């Protein structure tokens, strides 16, 4: 696979744009995370890597400390896209 | 301290510019890494996070697989700034 350093750069290269649902943004980013060495990062760390790339439309409502899992983040983000 | 997600964003926000010696670029980035939870990342992972942010003037000569430690990276980079 791709070297890890190149995955990290690609992960951080693109922030979530206004047109991009949280589900599809998260799928794309988690696909990059899955190419890193198995067992390197726990879910908390993966969420820490991803959180700041989320669009402000989510972060205004959901802070990092409010979610512990990707499932939580997606649940809340979907409501936000409907609220 | 700062939340981890904010550290990661700050770490990836600025690539190494032409005017910036490798020593001072690395010190700045490692100061961010030191604010993450102790024991989260090993040196290999830290190098993987940092490598792609190095200026192409180093990466043309030094590939990721050639270095195993920050000490190696700095040793080689200093020679490159003199070669």
How would you describe this protein?
Chains A, B: It comes from Drosophila melanogaster. Chains A, B: One of its GO terms (molecular function) is identical protein binding. Chains A, B: It is found in: Extracellular vesicle membrane; Synapse. Chains A, B: This is Activity-regulated cytoskeleton associated protein 1. Chains A, B: Its main location: membrane. The structure is a homodimer of 83-residue chains. With 83 residues, the first copy, chain A, is mainly alpha-helical. The first copy, chain A, has one domain. In chain A, 58% of the residues lie in helices and 0% in strands. The first copy, chain A, has 5 helices and no strands. Chain A has helices at 4-13, 22-33, 43-51, 56-59, 70-82. The first copy, chain A, is globular, with a radius of gyration of 13 Å. The interface between A and B is medium-sized, with 18 and 18 residues.
């Amino acid at each position: 696979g791709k070297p890890a350093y190149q995955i990290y750069m690609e992960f951080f290269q693109n922030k979530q744009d206004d047109h991009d649902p949280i589900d599809t943004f998260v799928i794309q980013k988690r696909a990059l995370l899955a190419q890193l060495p198995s067992g390197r990062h726990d879910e908390e760390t993966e969420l820490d890597l991803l959180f700041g790339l989320l669009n402000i439309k989510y972060r205004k409502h959901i802070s990092r400390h409010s979610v512990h899992t990707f499932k939580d983040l997606l649940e809340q983000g979907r409501i936000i896209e409907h609220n």
